[PDB]
Subunit: 140 residues, 3 copies
C-alpha cells in the first residue's frame, strides 16, 4: 500500500552526500535512516547519543504513524539500538526526525556520518475512544 | 480511523486524581498511560518495577491489538523504558493493563503517582494461517 | 483479519518435537516462536545468542510485515528480551527466522529447546514515497 509523504530537507547534504532514505526492494517494510553528522561520534558501552537525520516528515493523515526500530544486524552483533527502544512518529509531528542511539553492549562503536543506523516503518493506527463500562483468561 | 473501546476503571482515582489516558492532538498516534500508585517508587539503575494503571480495556475485535512503548523523552534522557521492551495487548485480554518499567540507565529515577510513564498505540493485526510448502536476497 | 502465509520447515523437528507457532485464542495478536536447539543454551547476564526457529516464512504481500517482540513474562520477570529489541520481517524475506535473544538482567538464564521464547505479530505496512517540499507543536 503506497502513500506520498511530505518531506522537508533540513540539511543540504541530505539527498546528496547523505542519501535520502529508500526501500531496497519492492518488498521491504522499512526505510533505513542515515546519520546526519559532521564527524564520527564514538559511542561508549552503555551510552546514548542523539543523532540528527537532517530531515522532517509530515505524515499528516491521522490514520498513519511511523515506528523507528533498530536494524537487526547492528542490534544483534553490535548492540547498537535505540535509547527509547522504539520511536513513534505522530502524524502531526513536523520537527526534525531524531534518532536516540544507545549502545547496549560491551564494545565501543563509531557512528559514522551517512551510516544507515536505524529503520522506519509506516503502519496504520487507530484512535481509541474509551467507553466506560461496569463489566465487559504474567517459566513461561 | 476511530474505534470505541470498552474500559473498566479498577481504581477509583483513575478518571479523577489520575486522568484517563487521552490523545493530546487530533494527530497523535499514542495515548499516554499514567502510573496508578499510592506513593512514589524509586527505581534504581538496572532495576524493573511493575506499575499498575488502574484500568482494564477490552479491545474485543481480533483485527486490532495495542502496543505499549516507552515515551521518547523518558527513554532517551532518563533511560526509563519497558522491561519487556514493547508490550502487546491482545484483543481478548480483559485484565489490568500493567507497565513493566525498566531503568536501563545509570541514574536513579523516581516514578511518581499520576506520571505519564509510557504510551500505547492501537494497530490493526492480521492472524496468519500457515501453509506448508516444500519451496517458495545478518558494518551494515 | 486472516491471511494464509507460506512456511517452509527447515528442521524436521518443527511441527513434531518443536510445535509450529500457533495462536492460543481466537483473539490472540501474536504467535509464540520456539527455540530450535539441539541442547539448552545458558545465557549469562548481558549476553546475546542467536536462536534458530527451524522455519522460514514468505509473507509475499508488500502490504504486510511481521514484528518479533519479547514475551511480557520473560521480559519483565527474567530480563529475556531481543538483542535488536524488535525484529522486522520483510515481505520478501525467505530465509530462516532467527531470534536474537538478549539477557538484559542480572540472572543467568537457560534457553531450552522447544521453549516459547518470543512472539510475532503480522501488521499492515505502508510504503512511503517522499514528496520534497519547501514548507509543510524531547520531567515529561
Ligand atoms: O529479529 C529478526 C529481525 C530480522 N530478521 C530477518 C528478516 C528480515 O527481513 C531481515 C532483515 O532485517 P533488518 O533489515 O532489520 N536487518 P539488517 O538491515 O541488518 O539486514 P539487511 O542488510 O539484509 O537488510 O532479517 C530475523 O530473522 N529476525
Ligand atoms: O525516536 C523518536 C521518537 C519520537 N520522535 C519525535 C516524533 C514524535 O512525534 C515526537 C514525540 O514522541 P513521544 O510522544 O514518544 N515523546 P515525548 O512524549 O517525550 O514528547 P512529547 O511531550 O512532545 O509528546 O518526537 C523522534 O524524532 N524520534
Ligand atoms: O506490557 C504489557 C504486555 C502485556 N500485558 C498483558 C496484556 C497481554 O494480552 C498479556 C499477555 O502478553 P504476552 O503474551 O506478551 N505475555 P506472556 O506470553 O508472558 O503471558 P501469557 O502466557 O498469558 O500469554 O499481558 C500487559 O499488561 N502489559
Ligand atoms: Mg535492513
Ligand atoms: Mg509524547
Ligand atoms: Mg503470551
Amino acid at each position: 500500500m503506497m502513500k506520498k509523504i511530505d518531506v522537508k530537507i533540513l540539511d543540504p547534504r541530505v539527498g546528496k552526500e547523505f542519501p535520502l532514505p529508500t526501500y531496497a526492494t519492492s518488498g521491504s517494510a522499512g526505510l533505513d535512516l542515515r546519520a546526519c553528522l559532521n564527524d564520527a561520534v564514538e559511542l561508549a558501552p552503555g551510552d546514548t547519543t542523539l543523532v540528527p537525520t537532517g530531515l522532517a516528515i509530515h505524515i499528516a493523515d491521522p490514520s498513519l504513524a511511523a515506528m523507528m526500530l533498530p536494524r537487526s544486524g547492528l542490534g544483534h552483533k553490535h548492540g547498537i539500538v535505540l535509547g527509547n527502544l522504539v520511536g513513534l512518529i505522530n502524524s502531526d509531528y513536523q520537527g526534525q526526525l531524531m534518532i536516540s542511539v544507545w549502545n547496549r553492549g560491551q564494545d565501543s562503536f563509531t557512528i559514522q556520518p551517512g551510516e544507515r543506523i536505524a529503520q522506519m516503518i509506516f503502519v496504520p493506527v487507530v484512535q481509541a475512544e474509551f467507553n466506560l463500562v461496569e463489566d465487559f483468561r504474567f517459566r513461561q
